[PDB]
Design a protein around this ligand. Structure first.
Ligand SMILES: Nc1ncnc2c1ncn2[C@@H]1O[C@H](COP(=O)(O)OP(=O)(O)OP(=O)(O)O)[C@@H](O)[C@H]1O
Ligand SMILES: Nc1ncnc2c1ncn2[C@@H]1O[C@H](COP(=O)(O)OP(=O)(O)OP(=O)(O)O)[C@@H](O)[C@H]1O
Lengths: 827, 300
C-alpha cells in the first residue's frame, strides 16, 4: 500500500546518489584554479543534497508511523533536487620550474649529501665495467630531491658521453618525454626533433640505436604512476656497462619497481636542526644572530613547526622579512597562531600550497575523504591507525562487492596506500604486528584542514580559531578541542559524528541524546560516566569509551542492531549485560580480561577481532562455543582457572578457525597444558606471541614445522629446556622476521649456559632482522657472515669461563649493521 | 519493455494488466530521462623490446618457417610470395616473425617491420613502411601529407630492382590489406612478404594457397614446463617437490600460450615463491569466478 511507493522511490534515490557521486568525483579532479565559480557553487549544492538523501535512505534502512515521515521527507528532497536542476541551466606553467634555476651558492648543507649520492653510484664507475644500475630517490612533498640530483649531475659530467634531465609531470605524454630525452642527448642532430611526429616506437628505436657503445647517465625525475615508467625502461634495455640512471619520485611503491635492490633506494631525510637554523638565518638575518636575543625562542618554535623541509622554511623566511625584518614579535605570534588553522589564506605563500596539493589531487577517489578525515584530530599527537580504520568503516568510506574481503583488510590497504604516497609518517609497531600510529606533517595538516573546511566536511572548535560558520543546521562532523566556552548545540539535528578531546566540559554542557541520528561516538579520555541514552541512538556504529570512568552501561544495548565497534579498555565495568548476544553485526570487541562475558557469544557470527578474552570460571560449552564463529583474525586470551582437559578442548576448537593472523596466550608460572602435540594449526598465522615469562613449555611444540604455518614472522617463545636441534628446526622456517627465545630453567634452576650449534644446512636464516636469545648462548662464531644477511641486533649470553676458550670467534664485521651490541655476561 | 511486448504479442482481461504495465514503464522511461539530464599506448608494444635470450623454443619453429619461405632463395628467381601466420591472442605470432626477420635480413636489400592496429589510418601505415625502408631519404616522411596515392607511388618507385622482405603484422579487416597489396604489384623475384593476423578468414585473402598459410600451435608440455620453471624458480625444479602437482595442474589450464604462462609466472613470484600450497590453490580455485579482478593482470 503506502510501503510500496516509498520502497520504489528508495532505489531511485540510490541511482541518483550514484550519478551525483560520479559527477562530484569528476568535478573534484581539476585543481580549484581552472574551475569556474558557477560550476563550483552548483557542485556544493549537489553535495549537500547528496548528504540529505543518504540520510533519508539510511533512516529507511535502520527503521525498516515512520513511513509517513519518510515519504514526506522523500517528496520534499525530490522537490529540492528538481528546483536546483533548472538554476544551472537558467544561468550559464609548473611552479617548480623556477626553483630549477637557483643560484648554486644559495644551498646550505648540500655538498655532503651530494657526495653520499655520488659515491653510492660511482664506486663501481671505478672499473666502469659493471652492468648499468639505477638509483632511485624518494621523499615527500618537496625536500631537495630534484636539486640534489642536479648537484650530483652537474658535478660528474666530464666522465661520460651523454646525459640529460627530463621531467615527467602528473599526466605525461610519452612522445613528449621521449623527444625531450632525444633532444638533450644532442641538440644539433635532433635540433628540430619536437616537430617530427612519428609514433611512440620509431623514436624509441632511434634513441636505442643512438646510445650504442656509450656511457651516459640519463636522469629522469618526478615519475609518478609506475605504469608510465615501464615504457621508458624499454628504451634502456641493451647492455651498456658503466652507464647509470637516476630516478626521483614521491611514490615509494614505484621505487622498488626500479633497480630491483633495496640498497639502491635512497630514502632522504629532512635537514638537521642546526642546518635548518643556519638556512633560516641566512635568509632573514643578514650576517649575525646575536642582536635579537628576544625572538630566539620564537625562531626555535617556528623552525620546529616546519620540521626540516627546505621548502617550508624558505617560504616562511621569505614571508617574514620583505625588507629588513618588517615584523617583530607581535605578528610573529599572530603567524604562529594562524598556522594550524588559517595561515595559508595569505600572499606569496600560495606558491607552495600547489606543490603540496599535487599529491592530494593525484590520489584516486575513495581516498580523498580518508585523507581529509585526518583534519579531525589535533595538531601534534600520534593517531592509532586502528581507530582510523574502524571510524572509516563505520562512516561508510570503505565498501566493496567482492565478498572475498573482510572489509577490514581493505581499510588497512587504504592506510598503507596513504603511507606509501609519502603523506603520513608511520611510527612504531603495534601489538598486532603492524604500524601502531601515524603522524602527519604540521604544514600539510593545517593545509588539509582548510581544504576540508571549504566544504562542511568537519567543524573544529578551537581557542586560537574561535570561529563559527553562519549555518548551524548544516553541520555533520564536530571535533571539540581545548575550547570549552561556546558549546551551542541547538541547531545541529542531523549530526553525522562527534568526538571530544581531553575536556572536562563534556556532559555538563554537552547534550548528546539530542542528536537523533548519529553514526559514531568517540569518547577517548573523558571522565564522564552517565551513558544511559545510547538506547535512543539506533544508527550508531562506532562507540569508543576507552578510559572514560564508565562504571556501568545500559541494559538495552541490544537494540543497536547496527554496530561495529565496542572499545571498553580502561573502564570501571566488570560485567557485560546479557543483552549483547542480541547484537547481530559486530566486527571488534575490545574488552579487558576482568570483565565477564554472558553466555551466548557464539551468536556473534560476524565478529572479526577479539581482544583480551578472560577465561575464569568457564564451563565446557562456553569454551566450545567460540569455535562455531569462524571469522576471527586477531585473538588475545588469558586465564587463571580452567587448566584441565578443557584446555585441549579449546585448543582443538581453535583449529576450526581458518582466518587467524595473530595469537597470544597469557598464563602465570605454569607448564602449558593447553597446546597438544597432535593438532593442526590454522593455515595462516603471522604473530603467535606468548608474552608470559613465568610460563614454559616442556619441549619444543611438534606442530611447529617449516611445512605448516609457513608465514610466521614472530615467536616470543619460552621453554624450560633448550636443544641444539630446536634452533636448527627454527632455522627451517621461511620468514620468521622476528626471533625471541627464553630459557626458563636457566633463570629458575642451576643450569649452565651451553653453546648450541647449527650443524645441518648452510644459512637457515635468509631474513631475520631481529634475533633474541635469553638464557641461551648464541655465539656469533656460529657461521660466517653469509648466514643471516639482514640482522640488525642480536642478543645472547656469554659465560665468563669461556673467555679463555677458543669458541668466541667474534671480531669480524658481519654483513648486517651488527657492530652495536652489549651482551649480558655472567661470572 | 521487450518482455512487455512479447507478453502482449503472445497473449493477443490481460489487457488491464498490460496497459497498467505500459503506463508505468513509460513512467520510469521519462523519470530516468530527466534524472540523466540533471547531471553533466599499446600494451603489447613494450613486449617487442624484450631480451632475445629469454625466449624458449623459438629456434625449432623459426628454422621451419625460414626454410619454408627461403627454400627458393637458392636460385632467387622465384616470384614473390607471402606467408600468413594465424593464431589467437598471444602465441608469439609477432615474436616468431621478428625472430625469423632478424636472422635472414643480411641477404635482402631492404626491409621494414610495420604494424597495423584495429582501426588503421592508411597514411600512417604507408608512412611507416616508407620510413623503415630508408631512414635518411625519408627521414621526416610523417610530416609530409600528400594523399593515399602519391606515397604509394613513392613506395613502388623505390622498390624497383630490389629484394625487400617486408613484414606486415596485425592485419584485421582484410579490406585494409587490399589497399596495401597495391604497393606490391610489380614483379620482384627474390623478395617476399610476411603477414600475421588473429583472423584466419583474412589469410586466404593472402598468398592464395593453403601450403603457405602457417597455422601455429601452442607450446608442448615439456617446453611449457621449462618456461614456467625458468621464470619462477631459480635453477632447479626438483627443489620444492611438494607443489609440483599444483604446478602441473595450473599449467594445464594455460595449456600452451606463452602469454598466460608468462602472466601466471610473474604473478606467482613476487619475491621467490611468496607462499606455497595455499596461494597456489588460491590461483587454481580463482580461475572461473574472480581471478581477473587482480593486479598487474589487467595488462593481459
Ligand atoms: N639544501 C638546500 N638548501 C637550500 N634550498 C634548498 C635545498 N634543497 C632544496 N632547496 C630548495 O627548496 C625547494 C624545494 O624544491 P625541490 O627541488 O626540493 O623539489 P623536489 O624535491 O623535486 O620536490 P617535488 O617532488 O615537490 O618536486 C627548491 O626551491 C629548492 O631549491
Ligand atoms: N616462444 C616464446 N617464449 C617466451 N616468451 C614468449 C614466446 N612467445 C611469446 N612470448 C611472449 O609472450 C608475448 C607474445 O606476444 P605475441 O608475439 O604473441 O603477440 P601476437 O602473437 O602478435 O598476439 P596479439 O594478437 O596478442 O598481438 C610476448 O610477451 C612475448 O615476449
Amino acid at each position: 500500500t503506502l510501503e510500496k511507493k516509498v520502497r520504489k522511490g528508495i532505489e531511485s534515490l540510490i541511482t541518483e546518489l550514484k550519478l551525483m557521486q560520479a559527477v562530484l568525483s569528476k568535478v573534484s579532479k581539476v585543481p580549484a584554479d581552472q574551475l569556474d565559480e558557477g560550476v563550483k557553487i552548483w557542485a556544493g549544492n549537489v553535495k549537500e543534497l547528496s548528504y540529505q538523501m543518504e540520510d533519508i535512505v539510511d533512516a529507511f534502512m535502520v527503521r525498516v508511523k515512520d513511513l509517513h515521515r519518510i515519504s514526506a521527507a522523500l517528496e520534499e528532497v525530490v522537490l529540492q533536487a528538481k528546483q536546483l536542476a533548472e538554476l544551472r541551466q537558467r544561468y550559464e606553467v609548473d611552479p617548480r620550474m623556477m626553483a630549477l634555476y637557483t643560484d648554486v651558492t644559495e644551498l646550505v648543507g648540500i655538498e655532503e649529501t651530494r657526495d653520499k649520492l655520488i659515491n653510492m653510484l660511482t664506486e663501481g664507475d671505478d672499473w666502469s665495467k659493471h652492468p648499468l644500475k639505477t638509483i632511485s630517490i624518494v621523499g615527500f612533498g618537496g625536500l631537495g630531491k630534484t636539486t640534489l640530483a642536479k648537484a650530483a649531475y652537474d658535478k660528474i659530467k666530464v666522465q661520460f658521453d651523454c646525459g640529460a634531465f627530463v621531467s615527467v609531470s602528473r599526466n605525461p605524454e610519452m612522445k613528449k618525454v621521449l623527444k625531450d630525452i632525444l633532444y638533450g642527448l644532442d641538440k644539433v642532430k635532433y635540433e628540430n626533433i619536437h616537430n617530427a611526429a612519428r609514433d611512440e616506437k620509431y623514436l624509441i628505436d632511434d634513441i636505442i640505436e643512438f646510445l650504442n657503445d656509450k656511457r651516459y647517465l640519463i636522469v629522469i625525475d618526478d615519475i609518478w604512476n609506475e605504469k608510465a615508467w615501464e615504457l621508458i625502461k624499454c628504451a634502456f634495455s641493451k647492455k651498456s656497462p658503466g652507464s647509470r640512471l637516476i630516478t626521483t619520485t614521491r611514490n615509494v611503491s614505484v621505487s622498488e619497481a626500479c633497480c630491483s635492490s633495496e640498497d639502491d633506494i635512497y630514502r632522504m631525510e629532512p635537514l638537521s636542526n642546526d642546518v635548518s637554523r643556519t638556512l633560516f638565518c641566512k635568509r632573514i638575518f643578514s650576517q649575525e644572530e646575536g642582536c635579537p636575543q628576544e625572538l630566539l625562542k620564537v625562531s626555535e618554535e617556528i623552525l620546529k613547526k616546519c620540521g626540516g623541509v627546505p621548502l617550508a622554511i624558505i617560504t616562511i623566511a621569505s614571508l617574514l622579512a620583505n625588507k629588513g625584518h618588517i615584523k617583530a614579535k607581535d605578528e610573529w605570534y599572530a603567524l604562529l597562531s594562524s598556522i594550524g588553522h588559517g595561515l595559508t589564506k595569505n600572499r606569496s605563500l600560495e606558491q607552495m600550497k600547489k606543490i603540496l596539493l599535487f599529491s592530494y589531487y593525484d590520489l584516486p577517489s575513495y581516498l580523498k575523504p580518508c585523507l581529509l578525515y585526518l583534519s579531525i584530530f589535533p595538531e601534534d599527537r600520534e593517531i592509532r591507525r586502528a581507530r582510523l580504520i574502524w571510524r572509516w568503516i563505520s562512516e561508510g568510506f570503505v565498501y566493496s562487492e567482492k565478498q572475498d574481503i573482510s572489509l577490514y583488510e581493505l581499510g588497512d590497504s587504504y592506510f598503507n596506500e596513504l603511507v606509501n604516497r609519502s603523506m603520513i609518517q608511520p611510527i612504531g609497531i603495534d601489538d598486532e604486528g603492524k604500524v601502531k600510529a601515524c603522524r602527519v606533517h604540521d604544514m600539510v595538516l593545517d593545509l588539509i584542514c582548510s581544504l576540508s573546511s571549504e566544504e562542511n566536511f568537519v567543524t573544529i572548535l578551537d581557542d586560537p580559531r574561535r570561529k563559527m560558520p553562519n549555518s548551524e543546521s548544516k553541520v555533520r562532523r564536530l571535533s571539540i578541542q581545548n575550547s570549552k566556552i561556546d558549546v551551542d548545540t541547538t541547531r545541529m539535528e542531523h549530526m553525522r559524528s562527534v568526538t571530544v578531546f581531553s575536556d572536562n566540559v563534556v556532559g555538563k554542557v554537552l547534550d548528546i541524546s539530542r542528536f537523533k541520528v548519529l553514526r559514531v561516538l568517540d569518547l577517548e579520555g573523558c571522565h564522564v560516566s552517565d551513558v544511559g541514552y545510547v538506547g535512543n541512538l539506533l544508527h550508531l556504529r562506532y562507540l569508543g569509551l576507552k578510559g572514560t570512568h564508565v562504571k556501568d552501561l545500559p541494559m538495552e544495548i541490544g537494540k543497536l542492531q547496527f554496530l561495529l565497534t565496542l572499545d571498553l579498555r580502561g573502564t570501571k565495568i566488570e560485567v557485560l549485560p546479557w543483552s549483547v548476544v542480541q547484537l547481530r553485526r559486530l566486527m571488534c570487541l575490545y574488552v579487558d580480561y576482568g570483565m565477564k562475558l554472558p553466555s551466548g557469544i557464539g551468536n556473534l557470527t560476524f565478529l572479526e577481532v577479539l581482544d583480551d578474552l578472560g577465561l575464569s570460571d568457564v564451563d565446557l560449552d562456553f569454551v566450545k562455543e567460540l569455535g562455531r564463529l569462524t571469522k576471527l583474525r586477531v585473538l588475545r586470551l588469558d586465564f587463571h582457572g580452567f587448566d584441565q582437559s578443557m584446555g585441549k578442548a579449546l585448543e582443538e576448537s581453535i583449529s576450526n578457525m581458518y582466518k587467524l593472523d595473530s595469537l597470544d596466550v597469557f598464563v602465570n608460572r605454569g607448564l602449558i597444558n593447553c597446546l597438544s602435540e597432535h593438532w593442526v594449526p590454522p593455515p595462516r598465522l603471522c604473530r603467535l606471541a606468548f608474552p608470559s615469562k613465568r610460563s614454559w613449555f616442556k619441549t619444543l611444540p611438534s606442530w611447529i614445522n617449516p611445512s605448516s604455518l609457513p608465514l610466521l614472522s614472530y615467536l616470543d617463545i619460552t621453554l624450560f629446556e633448550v636443544r641444539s636441534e630446536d634452533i636448527q628446526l627454527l632455522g627451517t622456517l621461511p620468514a620468521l622476521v622476528y626471533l625471541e627465545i627464553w630459557n626458563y630453567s636457566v633463570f629458575e634452576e642451576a643450569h649452565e649456559v651451553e653453546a648450541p650449534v647449527l650443524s645441518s644446512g648452510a644459512a637457515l636464516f635468509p631474513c631475520a632482522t631481529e634475533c633474541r636469545f635469553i638464557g641461551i648462548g648464541a655465539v656469533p662464531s656460529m657461521f660466517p657472515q653469509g648466514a643471516a644477511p639482514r640482522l640488525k641486533r642480536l642478543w645472547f649470553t656469554f659465560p665468563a669461563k669461556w673467555i679463555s676458550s677458543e669458541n668466541i670467534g667474534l671480531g669480524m664485521r658481519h654483513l648486517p649493521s651488527l657492530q652495536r651490541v652489549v651482551v649480558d655476561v655472567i661470572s
